[PDB]
Each structure stands twice: as structure tokens, then as C-alpha cells.
Design an enzyme around this catalytic site. Sequence first.
Site, PDB file in Angstrom:
ATOM      1  N   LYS A  23      42.422  44.820  60.072  1.00 49.06           N
ATOM      2  CA  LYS A  23      41.009  45.146  59.791  1.00 49.06           C
ATOM      3  C   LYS A  23      39.962  44.203  60.351  1.00 49.06           C
ATOM      4  O   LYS A  23      38.978  44.651  60.967  1.00 49.06           O
ATOM      5  CB  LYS A  23      40.823  45.185  58.260  1.00 49.06           C
ATOM      6  CG  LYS A  23      39.401  45.515  57.813  1.00 49.06           C
ATOM      7  CD  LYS A  23      38.723  44.306  57.183  1.00 49.06           C
ATOM      8  CE  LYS A  23      39.189  44.134  55.734  1.00 49.06           C
ATOM      9  NZ  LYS A  23      38.933  42.728  55.259  1.00 49.06           N
ATOM     10  N   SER A  24      40.133  42.906  60.100  1.00 46.62           N
ATOM     11  CA  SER A  24      39.301  41.795  60.557  1.00 46.62           C
ATOM     12  C   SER A  24      39.077  41.797  62.067  1.00 46.62           C
ATOM     13  O   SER A  24      37.961  41.710  62.586  1.00 46.62           O
ATOM     14  CB  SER A  24      39.964  40.462  60.162  1.00 46.62           C
ATOM     15  OG  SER A  24      39.807  40.240  58.751  1.00 46.62           O
ATOM     16  N   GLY A  96      32.916  44.167  53.152  1.00 39.36           N
ATOM     17  CA  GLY A  96      32.068  42.982  53.354  1.00 39.36           C
ATOM     18  C   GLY A  96      31.694  42.769  54.806  1.00 39.36           C
ATOM     19  O   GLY A  96      30.593  42.289  55.102  1.00 39.36           O
ATOM     20  N   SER A 168      33.212  33.082  53.854  1.00 34.39           N
ATOM     21  CA  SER A 168      33.142  32.757  55.283  1.00 34.39           C
ATOM     22  C   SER A 168      32.409  33.776  56.139  1.00 34.39           C
ATOM     23  O   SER A 168      31.941  33.433  57.231  1.00 34.39           O
ATOM     24  CB  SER A 168      34.566  32.618  55.836  1.00 34.39           C
ATOM     25  OG  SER A 168      35.192  33.888  55.962  1.00 34.39           O
ATOM     26  N   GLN A 169      32.283  35.046  55.753  1.00 34.78           N
ATOM     27  CA  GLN A 169      31.628  36.017  56.618  1.00 34.78           C
ATOM     28  C   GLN A 169      30.150  35.714  56.758  1.00 34.78           C
ATOM     29  O   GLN A 169      29.451  36.313  57.584  1.00 34.78           O
ATOM     30  CB  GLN A 169      31.813  37.439  56.075  1.00 34.78           C
ATOM     31  CG  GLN A 169      33.249  37.784  55.726  1.00 34.78           C
ATOM     32  CD  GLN A 169      33.404  39.177  55.145  1.00 34.78           C
ATOM     33  OE1 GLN A 169      32.450  39.926  54.934  1.00 34.78           O
ATOM     34  NE2 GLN A 169      34.636  39.577  54.860  1.00 34.78           N
ATOM     35  N   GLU A 311      42.905  36.247  50.634  1.00 28.03           N
ATOM     36  CA  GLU A 311      43.233  37.668  50.439  1.00 28.03           C
ATOM     37  C   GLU A 311      44.718  37.894  50.177  1.00 28.03           C
ATOM     38  O   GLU A 311      45.131  39.039  49.921  1.00 28.03           O
ATOM     39  CB  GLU A 311      42.748  38.483  51.652  1.00 28.03           C
ATOM     40  CG  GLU A 311      43.533  38.121  52.912  1.00 28.03           C
ATOM     41  CD  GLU A 311      43.061  38.786  54.187  1.00 28.03           C
ATOM     42  OE1 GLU A 311      42.223  39.720  54.135  1.00 28.03           O
ATOM     43  OE2 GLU A 311      43.529  38.372  55.282  1.00 28.03           O
ATOM     44  N   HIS A 340      34.977  38.732  45.228  1.00 27.75           N
ATOM     45  CA  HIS A 340      35.483  39.681  46.231  1.00 27.75           C
ATOM     46  C   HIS A 340      35.207  41.128  45.808  1.00 27.75           C
ATOM     47  O   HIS A 340      34.380  41.307  44.905  1.00 27.75           O
ATOM     48  CB  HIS A 340      36.970  39.419  46.463  1.00 27.75           C
ATOM     49  CG  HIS A 340      37.279  38.421  47.544  1.00 27.75           C
ATOM     50  ND1 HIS A 340      38.564  38.132  47.969  1.00 27.75           N
ATOM     51  CD2 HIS A 340      36.470  37.628  48.285  1.00 27.75           C
ATOM     52  CE1 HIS A 340      38.530  37.223  48.927  1.00 27.75           C
ATOM     53  NE2 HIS A 340      37.264  36.895  49.138  1.00 27.75           N
ATOM     54  N   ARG A 344      38.754  39.136  41.627  1.00 25.40           N
ATOM     55  CA  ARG A 344      40.198  39.260  41.680  1.00 25.40           C
ATOM     56  C   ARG A 344      40.908  38.364  40.677  1.00 25.40           C
ATOM     57  O   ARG A 344      42.009  38.786  40.271  1.00 25.40           O
ATOM     58  CB  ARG A 344      40.682  39.033  43.133  1.00 25.40           C
ATOM     59  CG  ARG A 344      40.457  40.285  43.982  1.00 25.40           C
ATOM     60  CD  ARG A 344      40.800  40.074  45.442  1.00 25.40           C
ATOM     61  NE  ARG A 344      40.795  41.289  46.249  1.00 25.40           N
ATOM     62  CZ  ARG A 344      40.814  41.349  47.573  1.00 25.40           C
ATOM     63  NH1 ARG A 344      40.829  40.225  48.289  1.00 25.40           N
ATOM     64  NH2 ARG A 344      40.809  42.526  48.205  1.00 25.40           N
TER      65      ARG A 344
HETATM   66  C1  LIG Z   1      38.237  40.337  51.094  1.00 28.48           C
HETATM   67  C2  LIG Z   1      38.741  41.100  52.314  1.00 28.48           C
HETATM   68  O1  LIG Z   1      39.075  40.111  53.514  1.00 28.48           O
HETATM   69  C3  LIG Z   1      38.421  38.992  54.283  1.00 28.48           C
HETATM   70  C4  LIG Z   1      38.171  39.321  55.752  1.00 28.48           C
HETATM   71  C5  LIG Z   1      37.218  38.318  56.324  1.00 28.48           C
HETATM   72  C6  LIG Z   1      36.774  38.602  57.698  1.00 28.48           C
HETATM   73  O2  LIG Z   1      35.763  38.015  58.159  1.00 28.48           O
HETATM   74  O3  LIG Z   1      37.305  39.565  58.305  1.00 28.48           O
HETATM   75  C7  LIG Z   1      37.115  37.063  55.844  1.00 28.48           C
HETATM   76  C8  LIG Z   1      37.525  36.655  54.440  1.00 28.48           C
HETATM   77  O4  LIG Z   1      36.411  36.654  53.466  1.00 28.48           O
HETATM   78  P1  LIG Z   1      35.855  35.513  52.335  1.00 28.48           P
HETATM   79  O5  LIG Z   1      35.685  34.241  53.200  1.00 28.48           O
HETATM   80  O6  LIG Z   1      34.484  36.109  51.929  1.00 28.48           O
HETATM   81  O7  LIG Z   1      37.070  35.387  51.391  1.00 28.48           O
HETATM   82  C9  LIG Z   1      38.749  37.517  54.090  1.00 28.48           C
HETATM   83  O8  LIG Z   1      39.161  37.204  52.737  1.00 28.48           O
HETATM   84  O9  LIG Z   1      37.719  42.320  52.567  1.00 28.48           O
HETATM   85  P2  LIG Z   1      36.143  42.467  52.746  1.00 28.48           P
HETATM   86  O10 LIG Z   1      35.978  42.536  54.291  1.00 28.48           O
HETATM   87  O11 LIG Z   1      35.597  43.719  52.128  1.00 28.48           O
HETATM   88  O12 LIG Z   1      35.464  41.241  52.147  1.00 28.48           O
HETATM   89  C10 LIG Z   1      40.147  41.612  52.148  1.00 28.48           C
HETATM   90  O13 LIG Z   1      40.794  42.065  52.972  1.00 28.48           O
HETATM   91  O14 LIG Z   1      40.700  41.380  51.132  1.00 28.48           O
END
Ligand SMILES: C[C@](O[C@@H]1CC(C(=O)O)=C[C@@H](OP(=O)(O)O)[C@H]1O)(OP(=O)(O)O)C(=O)O
Length: 424
Positions: A23-24, A96, A168-169, A311, A340, A344
Site C-alpha cells: 500500500k505505502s 492516512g 511520520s506521514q 503497523e 491510528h 489500536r
Molecule cells: C497505519 C497504516 O500504515 C502506515 C503507512 C505509512 C506510510 O507513510 O505509508 C506510515 C506509517 O504511519 P504512522 O507514522 O502515522 O504510524 C505506517 O504505520 O495506514 P494509514 O495509511 O491509513 O495510516 C497501516 O497500514 O496500518
Amino acid sequence: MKTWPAPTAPTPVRATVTVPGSKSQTNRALVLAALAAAQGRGASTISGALRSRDTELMLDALQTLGLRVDGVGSELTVSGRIEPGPGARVDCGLAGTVLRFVPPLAALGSVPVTFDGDQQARGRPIAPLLDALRELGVAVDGTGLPFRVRGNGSLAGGTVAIDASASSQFVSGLLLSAASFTDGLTVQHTGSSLPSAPHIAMTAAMLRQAGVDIDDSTPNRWQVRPGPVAARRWDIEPDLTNAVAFLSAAVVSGGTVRITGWPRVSVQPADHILAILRQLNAVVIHADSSLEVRGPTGYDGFDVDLRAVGELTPSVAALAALASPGSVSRLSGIAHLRGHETDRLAALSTEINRLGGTCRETPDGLVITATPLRPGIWRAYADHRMAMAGAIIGLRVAGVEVDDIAATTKTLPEFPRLWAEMVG
Ligand SMILES: C[C@](O[C@@H]1CC(C(=O)O)=C[C@@H](OP(=O)(O)O)[C@H]1O)(OP(=O)(O)O)C(=O)O
């Protein structure tokens, strides 16, 4: 909605599984492909792309901004320009990556663009990144969903300080578009506890593959120079976080499960993942371009720091609940999981205890004592990973049903089929 019965495994699971694209990486390729197109460099193709609710919200998000995204199966083509029509409105869903990666892009349009999302999405962190966009030149209406980015056809850029301890996003979304800002961008994370280092690294690696110059030589600081984003072909890897749910089945049943096409060198945290599995005495071998994991006849309690790979928490909690009777396991580094898809740590604790287990939330994680569990209804909270964690538990506990297995469509629409096929 009917429930989904989690099939048990009274004997060691043995299977070969193919999981679809990451997905990422998919959503990062789509954003980078949109910037290339908007800059006038032509169409890009993404091969092995994940088709799931999260990536469909991303491409509809790009189509709302004016771009064109084609394809029927795993091959998608991006082209066109950014040019939102009147009343343009991005649906972020519970994704997200869309909520965080697309408002900067929107700052390149000269038309207003609203952002909205599911009721459950309005409880997720977003305010710090909106403040940063404001400090960079962009008029933004509102500090949460729904908000509006009233762009002016371009974005100056410069330097900006942000507290990204919540996600981190916030960094990735700023870094992905920085190359199209006049001055580029320098981003500084203030303070400490910056979760998910591998996903910021993922952004940096893919920015370089598109010819963008990014300097990440100093921790908590990133400098990106203004310049072209390349039109190119993207090849997507299997999603390694989802592969861990299937691998977990080998681990708890004493079985063997292979994953096809496991990358020997990935843009994903494969190294962290294999270490964790070996902490439980699984044997892990690379073979046939496939990864094979052989579960132990049994395993005890473990202590694990999940700060860089948060995750994985739902699947690793399930593993912890199924350790030998009386084992204590401690999961740390994951306070940010409180924001999240769902909270969670609260949800895992509730659903394990409902099955008669013993899981306690801590200021940064969970402490879980393996104890006999009983049948029940495992709730997903509209969260793809809560749902898969229910499936892992069920392998070893008769009578478990997930209320909403369709939650898995966020990143794995075919989970039910693939999961049946493995346990068969
Ligand atoms: C949470 C989740 O996955 C995330 C995917 C993500 C990215 O940039 O692709 C960064 C992280 O976020 P953070 O730093 O905010 O923990 C991961 O945990 O999905 P999301 O894209 O809806 O937030 C997932 O797969 O579980």
C-alpha cells in the site's frame, strides 16, 4: 452484517501464499506520478499496483485534482495536469496517506479544494501539517476535517519546523511535493519520538529513484531541492506487513508458510520483520525468490520494540496471546498507535480481554499474559489489521468470529479467499 468464522488449524498449516502489492509504495508512486505529469513530463505507469480501498481513494483523489488515472488490473497509468474544477472535494476515507499526502499537491492548483473523510477519520491527527502548510504560503480553512486548501497555482516553499511525533506521514507528505516548490523545502522535526523511520526512508528512497535530490544526512532534518520529478515506470513489491499475517499462521501452528516474490532488497522494513519472527524461534529461509518460515513446536513470552514498525502491532499481539500458558509479553514504542485507524492499543486490549485473555495497555504499548481463551466475537473497528489479528487468534481458538472481515478491503480485498486457501 453477518460475521466471519475464523477457521481453526488443529494441525500444522502448510501453504504457499501470494500477497498483492504494498500500500505505502503504491500510494507514493501515484503521488510522484501525479507531480511528474503536472510538471509536463508525461504519463507514468505503476506495475504490480495494489487495488484496494486505500489506493482507490488515492487515485480518485488525484482525479479530483484534475489528473487522469487509468487501468483495470494491477497496471495503472497517470497523466494530465493539476487543475481542480469548481467545488472540488477529496474524499480521504480512512486513508492516512490521502489525508496527509494530497493537501500539499493541492497547493499547486489555483482553485479551492475541500478535504473530507469518514466520521472515524476526523479523529486522526492532521493539525500540525496544516499549520506547516500555512507557514509555507498556503491559505488553509479549518484545522481538521473538513478543511480547505485554497491554492494559488504554486508554492514558494522554504524552511519549516513541525512536531511529527504523532505521525511520520506529516514528513512524508511534505517531502513528496517539495520538489515542485519554488525554493524546495527544508523540514525540521522538533523534539523526540519520531515513529516509523522506515516509512520516511521509503519516501526518500523513492524520491531519489525519480531523480529528486534529498539530503537526509542529519537525523530529524531533510533538505529537498526544487527540480524535476521524473516520469518513469514503478514496480511494486508485495506488501510485507500483510505477509506477516499469513506468516503468523506458520508460527502458531508449528507449520510452514511461503510467500512468493519476497524481495531480497526492499523499500520496506523486511529486516525488522524477519528479526521479530526469529525472536520466536521460527526458522526463516530465503528460497525460490520466495520466503519460507517454519514455526517452532512452541514459543514463550517475548519483549519487542515496535516503534519503527508500529503497523505490526495487531498481528504481533495475537502471537503474544497464543504463546505458552502463563508467558508474559511486552510490546513497546507505540504510543502513537492511540491515533491510528482506531486507537489500536485500547481496541486490542478490549478484544483480547473479551476472549478471556489478559492484555493491559501501558503508556507506550501492551503487556500480554498468555492464558486460555474462549469463543467470541472479535471486533474490527473498521480496521483491516484488527480484522486479520482476529483471524490469527481463531487458528488456535475454536468459536472465534470477526464481525466485519470486509474491513480488510483497505489494503487486502481478497484476504478471506487467500486465508481460506492457506488453512484450506
Ligand atoms: C497505519 C497504516 O500504515 C502506515 C503507512 C505509512 C506510510 O507513510 O505509508 C506510515 C506509517 O504511519 P504512522 O507514522 O502515522 O504510524 C505506517 O504505520 O495506514 P494509514 O495509511 O491509513 O495510516 C497501516 O497500514 O496500518
